[PDB]
Ligand binder design. Structure first.
Ligand SMILES: [Cl-]
Ligand SMILES: [Cl-]
Ligand SMILES: [Mg+2]
Ligand SMILES: [Mg+2]
Ligand SMILES: [Mg+2]
Ligand SMILES: [Mg+2]
Ligand SMILES: [Mg+2]
Ligand SMILES: [Mg+2]
Ligand SMILES: [Mg+2]
Ligand SMILES: [Mg+2]
Ligand code: NA
Ligand code: NA
Ligand code: NA
Ligand code: NA
Ligand code: NA
Ligand SMILES: [Sr+2]
Ligand SMILES: [Sr+2]
Ligand SMILES: [Sr+2]
Ligand SMILES: [Sr+2]
Ligand SMILES: [Sr+2]
Ligand SMILES: [Sr+2]
Ligand SMILES: [Sr+2]
Ligand SMILES: [Sr+2]
Ligand SMILES: [Sr+2]
Lengths: 186, 140, 160, 154, 95
RNA sequence: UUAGGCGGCCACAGCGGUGGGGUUGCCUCCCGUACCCAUCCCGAACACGGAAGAUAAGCCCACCAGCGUUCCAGGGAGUACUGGAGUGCGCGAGCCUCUGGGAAAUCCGGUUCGCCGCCACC
RNA sequence: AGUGCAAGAGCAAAAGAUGACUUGACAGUGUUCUUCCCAACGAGGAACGCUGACGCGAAAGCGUGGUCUAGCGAACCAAUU
RNA sequence: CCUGUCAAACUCCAAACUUACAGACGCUGUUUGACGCGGGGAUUCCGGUGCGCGGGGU
């Protein structure tokens, strides 16, 4: 900017999207990366392999396409996060992937958060990712019980668009069950 | 447009810089929340050698806690022209500072792909005065 | 001391004051002479003194020659005449002298010289056509007080 | 295709230069070689610039020289058309001299020594202290000037 | 020299050019190399570890295996052969 | 890529500016604290739940060259400096001829307001 | 800016600062280079591994001291396990 | 703004040139065995001059 001596950051550091310190420490494993990234209305999970010109994505899963198998609920919560992670892991197994490491980017490693919930799903899917069980949320909160009891304090329905009043953490079980299913067009 | 541009009280800091404290309590009362210590840096010849040590205590009032506090705090002070910062901020007086800003300030306060607010979307001293004056008081 | 001792450029550039100390003050009074307010472009005639051989000129020889050059101009054009002379060189080169035979031979600082490649302008005066003769004489005195042979080249003004 | 001719001795001559000369199959003053004009072969002669005399010869001249100063890989036998004919892929000296210039083959390939051991220039050379442009006999020559040397060194 | 440590006369080669300051890209610091491959030796002033003795910059060795994640690179100092322990961070493929 | 995620090179990408863009799609700003989690004080941030409103921010698109930068042309300049040679010149410091290389500042006109890979998606 | 001290060099979602937890300044055996360019030479030094045990972190991973290059010493004798 | 100068321990720049590896050409080795490896015997560790680049010193 100023002159010849000025030092301009790597593009992805200006944009503040990649923490290269945590990135290098991540690549050292030699294993692929289970990229867990959020969004306000969504949650995604990619599988990254190192490449000559840039990272290669061999498997992914967006919370949006989590509907193609029967999903009427929202797409930015705990149940959605676990499921999206489970989906990608299943597609991941398909390509040949058998192990990966958790990449959460700039998201905080907060106990029982959505990213660990995403991690849990891909592991449940058959993948081998170094984890720490107790840092994960409990099964009920993953299912969506924390939100079901929130809707208990009704007086005003939680969901705008029709789904149902008290909601259904069963829809979670119904979909999870559908993924473990041998058939299902991945 | 006017909607995603109409300013608001982001935070209201109220602190009492001492130099050696016990005064914390008065704020915890008038504000309605908990205060926090205030350290320091560099050795000072006015018996202030201990670098990290309790000198004052501030309180960051946001949302309602701030407004309800301003209903009384504002009248207690005569506002002036020169009392305004270029980014539409003012301090008066015990001290009271109001940090004002336009709707999407989370863009510069978040962790993921944060960005600095463009000079255009940056609040103006004049545009700030008008906003405040538009709420039970005068100006210069 | 004789200029034979320092007239040639045979040592490395020794100018880094952040390492050198006891450096003697410059005998040179001033580089800006004449009417240091009027521009060089405000004058029809511009004459410089060109050094024909690359050398090192000590501040005492720099001052001496410049003095006897400007003394003439002041004498012939009056103390406030319509001219302005210059000396574009500053003595950056530090000099020493080992003053015990060759043991611990590094000399102590004795003065400052000014390096000048051949064909360079040691001086450059600015005057009007009528005074263009006292300038050519001021330089004829100036070149006698320095080591190399010099040339008086006229930069502007073919008036003759 | 140029013709290298050592005119300056080995004594005091920088080692890396005499080695290049040796690589160019020349180990004695007045010895000569026929070198192609390639990126590589060029770098060498340029390094040999000050201790040699070179240029491109006229075919006529190259034929008179091959006639006189050329020899087999091993032997005292004189190379003449009749000799050329029986050993080379040619019919006479001219045919040979032609191929060398057009850079179609080499002296070795045709069972001939790479060195044309010449005789001291008749009437002396123009000097070994200055280049050709300065009135000396070193460096690069003219297709006429090179012939003048070579022929004097029959 | 006035001292004979490893960093003697290493101001130039071991310094970063202004615009190259700060942390370096991980892509090369994790690069994979094969045995028999030719690699250029040059330290990355930004990377503190996995360095070889400064004196060996500009070399072009042949990878012959690894030690941990770091590499064992053969080179020929003058006439003497040496095996150098270095990380990919200071290595570049020939050609 | 009518706004996405991961990158490579790491300013050709910087600095600054102009203009354009989003009904059930996206990213956002946005809305809100029962929970996971959270602040030496603030649901600000982090974390969680959610769509009433908006495209002003950001972001994506198109464009500007004033600064910085990359490269190109002519100018400077085959100048400065230089590897090889010389019974070439100079009292000398030094210079010159041939040979093979060859800048820098700066001026002038251009170029640059990133290019590329993987996956995803009307 | 700071980073214990010469100088030179390295570092900004850190190598700097604050906070907490921790004591890896751990046990054991090596590879390579350095000391000693090339080119033989000891003590010392460093980078890079392996095995055991540990600290931390969600995990990758980081920790064989203080960001790197100075702070070091033979046999004999003595004391200690 | 304009104007005048510098740097062995300065550098936005930057050669010639030296240098690692590789290929090509050259030269060289496969009865003259190169390259390399092992062993025996040394001498030697007062150097000097020219040229280029030097550092100190009139
Ligand atoms: Cl994210
Ligand atoms: Cl090494
Ligand atoms: Mg023979
Ligand atoms: Mg005769
Ligand atoms: Mg003669
Ligand atoms: Mg140097
Ligand atoms: Mg707009
Ligand atoms: Mg002479
Ligand atoms: Mg004893
Ligand atoms: Mg003891
Ligand atoms: Na405290
Ligand atoms: Na870097
Ligand atoms: Na906008
Ligand atoms: Na040792
Ligand atoms: Na000796
Ligand atoms: Sr000298
Ligand atoms: Sr004596
Ligand atoms: Sr004179
Ligand atoms: Sr809020
Ligand atoms: Sr003489
Ligand atoms: Sr003399
Ligand atoms: Sr050219
Ligand atoms: Sr270290
Ligand atoms: Sr050298």
């Amino acid at each position: 900017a100023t002159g010849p001596r000025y030092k301009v950051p790597m593009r992805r550091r200006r944009e503040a999207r990649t923490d290269y310190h945590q990135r290098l420490r991540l690549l050292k494993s030699g294993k692929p990366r289970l990229v867990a990234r959020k969004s306000n209305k969504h949650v995604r999970a990619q599988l990254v392999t190192l490449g000559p010109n840039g990272d290669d994505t061999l498997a992914s899963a967006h919370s949006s396409d989590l509907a193609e198998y029967g999903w009427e609920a929202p797409t930015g919560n705990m149940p959605s996060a676990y499921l999206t992670g489970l989906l990608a892991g299943l597609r991941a197994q398909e390509a040949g992937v058998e192990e990966a490491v958790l990449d959460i980017g700039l998201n905080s490693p907060t106990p029982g958060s959505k990213v660990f919930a995403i991690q849990e799903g891909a592991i449940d899917a058959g993948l081998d990712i170094p984890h720490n069980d107790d840092v994960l949320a409990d099964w009920q909160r993953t299912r969506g019980a924390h939100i079901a009891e929130y809707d208990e304090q009704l007086e005003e329905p939680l969901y705008s668009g029709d789904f149902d009043a008290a909601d259904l953490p069963e829809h979670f079980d119904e979909l999870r069950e559908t993924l473990l299913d041998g058939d299902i067009e991945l | 447009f006017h909607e995603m541009r109409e300013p608001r009280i982001e935070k209201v800091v109220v602190h009492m810089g001492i130099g050696h404290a016990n005064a914390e309590d008065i704020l915890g009362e008038i504000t309605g929340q908990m205060p926090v210590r205030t350290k320091a840096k560099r050795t000072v010849g006015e018996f202030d050698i201990r670098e990290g040590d309790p000198i004052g205590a501030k309180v960051t009032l946001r949302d309602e806690m701030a407004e309800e506090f301003l209903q009384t705090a504002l009248p207690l002070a005569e506002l002036a022209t020169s009392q305004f910062d270029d980014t539409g901020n003012f301090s008066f007086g015990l001290d009271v500072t109001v940090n004002l800003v336009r709707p999407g300030y989370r863009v510069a306060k978040r962790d993921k792909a944060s960005r600095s607010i463009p000079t255009k979307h940056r609040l103006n001293p004049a545009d700030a005065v008008a906003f405040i004056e538009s709420t039970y008081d005068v100006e210069v | 001391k004789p200029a034979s001792m320092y007239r040639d450029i045979d040592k490395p550039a020794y100018t880094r004051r952040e390492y050198i100390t006891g450096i003697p003050g410059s005998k040179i009074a001033q580089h800006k002479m004449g009417r240091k307010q009027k521009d060089a472009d405000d004058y029809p005639v511009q004459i410089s003194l060109i050094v024909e051989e690359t050398v090192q000129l000590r501040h005492g020889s720099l001052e001496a020659s410049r003095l006897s050059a400007n003394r003439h101009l002041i004498k012939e054009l009056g103390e406030e005449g319509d001219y302005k002379m210059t000396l574009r060189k500053f003595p950056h080169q530090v000099l020493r002298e080992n003053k015990d035979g060759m043991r611990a031979a590094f000399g102590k600082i004795v003065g400052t010289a000014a390096r000048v490649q051949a064909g360079e302008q040691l001086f450059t005066a600015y005057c009007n056509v009528e005074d263009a003769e006292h300038v050519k004489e001021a330089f004829r005195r100036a070149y006698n007080k320095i080591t190399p042979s010099c040339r008086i080249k006229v930069e502007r003004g073919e008036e003759l | 295709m140029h013709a290298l001719v050592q005119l300056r001795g080995e004594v005091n001559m920088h080692t890396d230069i005499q080695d290049t000369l040796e690589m160019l199959n020349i180990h004695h003053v007045n010895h000569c070689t026929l070198v192609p004009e390639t990126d590589a072969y060029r770098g060498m002669v340029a390094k040999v610039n000050d201790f040699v005399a070179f240029g491109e010869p006229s075919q006529e001249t190259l034929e008179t020289v091959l006639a006189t100063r050329a020899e087999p890989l091993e032997g005292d036998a004189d190379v003449d058309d009749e000799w050329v004919a029986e050993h080379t892929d040619y019919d006479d000296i001219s045919g040979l001299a032609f191929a060398l210039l057009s850079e179609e083959t080499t002296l070795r390939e045709q069972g001939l020594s790479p060195t044309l051991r010449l005789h001291p220039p008749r009437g002396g050379h123009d000097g070994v202290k200055h280049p050709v442009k300065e009135g000396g006999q070193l460096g690069k020559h003219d297709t006429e000037g090179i012939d003048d040397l070579l022929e004097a060194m029959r | 020299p006035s001292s004979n440590g490893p960093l003697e006369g290493t101001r130039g080669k071991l310094k970063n050019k202004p615009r190259d300051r700060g942390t370096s890209p991980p892509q090369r610091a994790v690069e994979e190399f094969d045995d028999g491959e030719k690699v250029h030796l040059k330290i990355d002033p930004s990377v503190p570890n996995g360095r070889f003795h400064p004196r060996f910059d500009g070399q072009t060795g042949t990878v012959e295996g690894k030690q941990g994640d770091a590499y064992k690179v053969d080179i020929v100092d003058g006439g003497k052969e040496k095996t150098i322990i270095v990380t990919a961070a200071h290595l570049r493929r020939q050609e």
